Amino acid sequence: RGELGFDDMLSRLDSALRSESGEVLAAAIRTRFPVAMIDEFQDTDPQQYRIFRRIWHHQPETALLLIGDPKQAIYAFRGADIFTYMKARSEVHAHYTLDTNWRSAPGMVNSVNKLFSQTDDAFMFREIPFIPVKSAGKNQALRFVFKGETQPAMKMWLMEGESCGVGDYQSTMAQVCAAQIRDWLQAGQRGEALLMNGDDARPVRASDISVLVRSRQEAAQVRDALTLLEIPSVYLSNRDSVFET
Amino acid sequence: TPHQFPRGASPGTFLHSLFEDLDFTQPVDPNWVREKLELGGFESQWEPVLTEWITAVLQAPLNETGVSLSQLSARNKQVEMEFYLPISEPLIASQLDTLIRQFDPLSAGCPPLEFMQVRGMLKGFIDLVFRHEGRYYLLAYKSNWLGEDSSAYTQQAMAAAMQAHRYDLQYQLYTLALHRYLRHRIADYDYEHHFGGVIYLFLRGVDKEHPQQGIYTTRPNAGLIALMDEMFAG
Amino acid sequence: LLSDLESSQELDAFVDVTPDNLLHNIQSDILELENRAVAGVNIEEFSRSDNKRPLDPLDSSI
Amino acid sequence: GHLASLLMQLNIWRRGLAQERPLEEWLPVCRDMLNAFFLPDAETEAAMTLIEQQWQAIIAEGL
Amino acid sequence: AETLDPLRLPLQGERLIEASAGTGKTFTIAALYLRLLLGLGGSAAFPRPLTVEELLVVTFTEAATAELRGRIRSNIHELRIACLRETTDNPLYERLLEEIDDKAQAAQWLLLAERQMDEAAVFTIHGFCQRMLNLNAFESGMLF
Amino acid sequence: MLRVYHSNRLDVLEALMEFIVERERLDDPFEPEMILVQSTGMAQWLQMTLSQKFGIAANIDFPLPASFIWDMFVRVLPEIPKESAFNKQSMSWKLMTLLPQLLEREDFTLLRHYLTDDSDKRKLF
Amino acid sequence: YGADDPRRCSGNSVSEVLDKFRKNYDLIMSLPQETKEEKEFRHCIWL
Amino acid sequence: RQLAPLGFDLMSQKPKRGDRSRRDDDRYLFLEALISAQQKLYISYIGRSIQDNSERFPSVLV
Amino acid sequence: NLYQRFIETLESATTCPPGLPSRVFICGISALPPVYLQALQALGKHIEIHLLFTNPCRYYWGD
Ligand SMILES: Nc1ncnc2c1ncn2[C@@H]1O[C@H](COP(=O)(O)OP(=O)(O)NP(=O)(O)O)[C@@H](O)[C@H]1O
Secondary structure, three states, X not given: OOOOOHHHHHHHHHHHHHOOOHHHHHHHHHHHXXXXXXXXOOOOOHHHHHHHHHHHOOOXXXXXXXXXXXXXXXXXXXXXXXXXXXXXXXXXXXXXXXXEEOOOOHHHHHHXXXXXXXXXXXXXXOOOOOOOOEEOOOOOOEEEEEOOEEOOOOOOOOOOOOOOOHHHHHHHXXXXXXXXXXXXXXXXXXXXXXXXXXXXXXXXXXXOOOOOOOOHHXXXXXXXXXXXXXXXXXXXXXXXXXXXX | OHHHOOOOHHHHHHHHHHHHOOOOOOOOOXXXXXXXXXXXXXOOOHHHHHHHXXXXXXXXXXXXXXXOHHHOOHHHEEEEXXXXXXXXXXXXXXXXXXHHHXXXXXXXXXXXXXXXXXXXXXXXXXXXXXXXXXXXXXXXXXXXXXXXXXXXXXXXXXXXXXXXXXHHHHHXXXXXXXXXXXXXXXXXXXXXXXXXXXXXXXXXXXXXXXXXXXXXXXXXXXXXXXXXXXXXXX | OHHHOOOEEEEEOOEOOOOOOHHHHHXXXXXXXXXXXXXXXXXXXXXXXXXXXXXXXXXXXX | OHHHHHHHHHHHHHHHOOOOOXXXXXXXXXXHHHXXXXXXXXXXXXXXXXXXXXXXXXXXXXX | OEEOXXXXXXXXXXXXXXXXXXXXXXXXXXXXXXXXXXXXXXXXXXXXXXXXXXXXEEEOOHHHHHHHHHHHHHHHHHXXXXXXXXXXXXXXXXXXXXXXXXXXXXXXXXXXXXXXXXXOOEXXXXXXXXXXXXXXHHHHOOOO | OEEEEEEOOHHHHHHHHXXXXXXXXXXXXOOOEEEEOOOHHHHHHHHHHHHHHHOOEEOEEOOOHHHHHHHHHHHHOOOOOOOOOOOHHHHHHHHHHHHHHHOOXXXXXXXXXXXXXXXXXXXXX | OOXXXXXXXOEOOXXXXXXXXHHOHHHHHHOXXXXXXXXXXXXXXXX | OOOXXXXXXXXXXXXXXXXXXXXXXXXXXXXXXXXXXXXXXXXOOOOOOOOOOOOOOOOOOO | OHHHHXXXXXXXXXXXXXXXXXXXXXXXXXXXXXHHHHHHHHHOOOOEEEEEEEOOOOOOOOO
């Protein structure tokens, strides 16, 4: 049919580079793009690394910058592999690191550092060592005040009981999350709950609250209970079709 | 036979395209007619006959000057001329039909023109324009199947068909266009001196036996042309 | 290319545009081959905004 | 009986169009296919003529 | 493993930059892009200054690609304005200005880049593959 | 002589064209006027404006620069065909024949690797 | 520069340009062609 | 609108004055549209996607 | 190959060749190949050619 697909695109480029004429093709890509910067390199397929190596490995006057975090390699289901990332990590001599966290309050950074320092080799891979990170000076003032009382950066809601089933766990946690989000919204509508950078503040709108879920049925279980309280919500990963309504 | 030739929009366009690229100063070529019938897809049986028919068109005489289409050189002819005529004030059917009926009997025979007000431009394609003896003419091809017999292509029947398909207004507008173009181009132009009339050529009506059958000749009144020009101008 | 023609005789017939609108201001800036934007290199130039041209609030040309 | 008459045609042509042919042999194919499969009408005649014209132009350049 | 300074990072051969979350991995892309456009760093710099069309950036998602393209555009604009004014309020731009030898030529190159930003080569992996196949269907052996 | 008219707006140019047409008349009435345009909309606008000014616009040829240049080739020099032998459409079918005959050459080695796996001459075409 | 020359038809409105051209049509046509050096000199003076 | 050269075209390697490309053609069309506007110029573009409430951007010309 | 011969024929032609139109207008075209400009310059001797060029800037803005 003369058609083509994503996996077919990658496989065809790889085959071309591996073939006899691919050498010429390599120059065609190398002269075109002297420097290439790959981001989110932890999610990498063996094909992609073979291509990048074939093109930019040892030729002069051509740089290559790999930027990635192995602790975030979560696309294994999609064909990505962490082992090829570690292979690349072994094949590269130079390594560079960023020390400070610029994203979140110093509370969240300390919370994460404490939770991942419990055991040794937490990620159970010898090539993935965990180290504590330090927050930046800009965020030292960040706080979240709820009903006049500063809330802890991280709060774990423990369910009650000895043995809890999967369905009971899902229903109870969905209900609890719905109730807590409703309380946050009610307290922010009156100007009490504020996200504060030093003296500046702003109420907690229904937009800044995000619920991270793993599966579709999980998201629907969240959304149903959240709409039971007449709270507007939307699921960004919704792939349903309009015609099914 | 030409009368029994297939008719329609595409047959008519093919018949016109034949003359569009036909050289009048040379005899018809059989291979060319065969190729055109191959393009149109018609039967090759027409190829011997149609060629002859084409010559019957080229050699047929015209208005009393006696002009043959073969006598027209490439310098004295203009085929498929496109014209643009502006109409400034709105053109009312009643305010025009009255004048056309006043100066033309064909309009007087027919019911009044009916169309909505129009202001803007007017487009049109004149089939042929040619000059003979320093006198210009207008030639319009028509392939409408008036009748099955040659009597349906006589003077009275041709005038009846003109009145039925309202070709009167058509040739009147064509004459206004030609008049304005000649006045624009020809230095020291005069209507009566330089204009020669209008010639409707019915292809199927063309017969070597009868000179009158197939051709129709009519000259619009100069007063009608002047009043129509003034009406369309303001 | 047009300037490089040897046997060419050219006359210029332009029409000046009066800057009565924002759109006419832009067209006049283009026609007169002059630059109106202020970069603000000087601190005195950067402080005051009078160097720019007044824009009428009701104006809706662009 | 009508449907079975269509498929029969659909059979014949699907055997005729398989083999490769020189350009001059491709000339009558379009016309035969049009007149066999289609019964023209006032509106469709324009499209059919355009089809024949483009096909003839392609094969004419080729020849 | 060494601590990373965007201005001192050498751009030659293969280089791996690994860090934890929210540490500014993506944010460093813009600084490296500006360094490449202006050819700054001396010994650590590229041998020659480059153009927008010769820098390849590969991201994971389309939305991230659009975000990064817009942010690079904004950074080029702000750095050009700073070069024209010779002063700035950001520490990164301040260090860059300290590193730049001639500011007028730098502003000219930044202007050209800003005008060519429509042709910025910021793709995903699949888009990069498709584009390299189409631009080189002759060598790859594909259809046109 | 070749006279170039510069104007920031088109209406001035069109009115200059009008005045030049009216000033110097064509001797032969059947000689068509020559106006080069690369778009049909431009020709449509020129016609609608010229008709509005003069009273009617007709016998105005609107050829493309390439077609006009070839027409001038035909008229100035003898023994020149009506249509050029080398055109975009015919060079296609000529190269389609020529390419298989030249694959054995060394210079076309790359092309060979391109044309090795074609089945119905898709790559060739 | 060049205002006295009949060639220049630059004006404030379309009608003024058309009239300035119409009055000096014959004078423009009769004038001999400008030399390339003269054209370059005029364009340099205008800049 | 972007239409890249074939890649084995020799013109785009060493270009000269007068060589035409789609990019320059569109960039000049945008200037023609501005210059030809006599009274009002209206420009529109999609800012946010209706489906995802994402953020789109305007052309470099705008 | 025809360009140079066409230019040289009119360059050395003592009188105007027959069949050429009186005058030509070039309106609405802001881009032409240099070869077409050379041909029109060589052809301008015999017949007059009026180029209507919409120029957005008053002054000389090319190079
Ligand atoms: N040098 C810096 N100065 C100021 N803010 C910074 C700096 N580096 C990063 N940030 C900010 O830090 C936040 C997150 O940085 P980011 O570039 O996304 O790191 P990241 O590695 O991409 N996080 P992630 O994508 O989850 O791995 C943004 O708000 C940036 O503006």
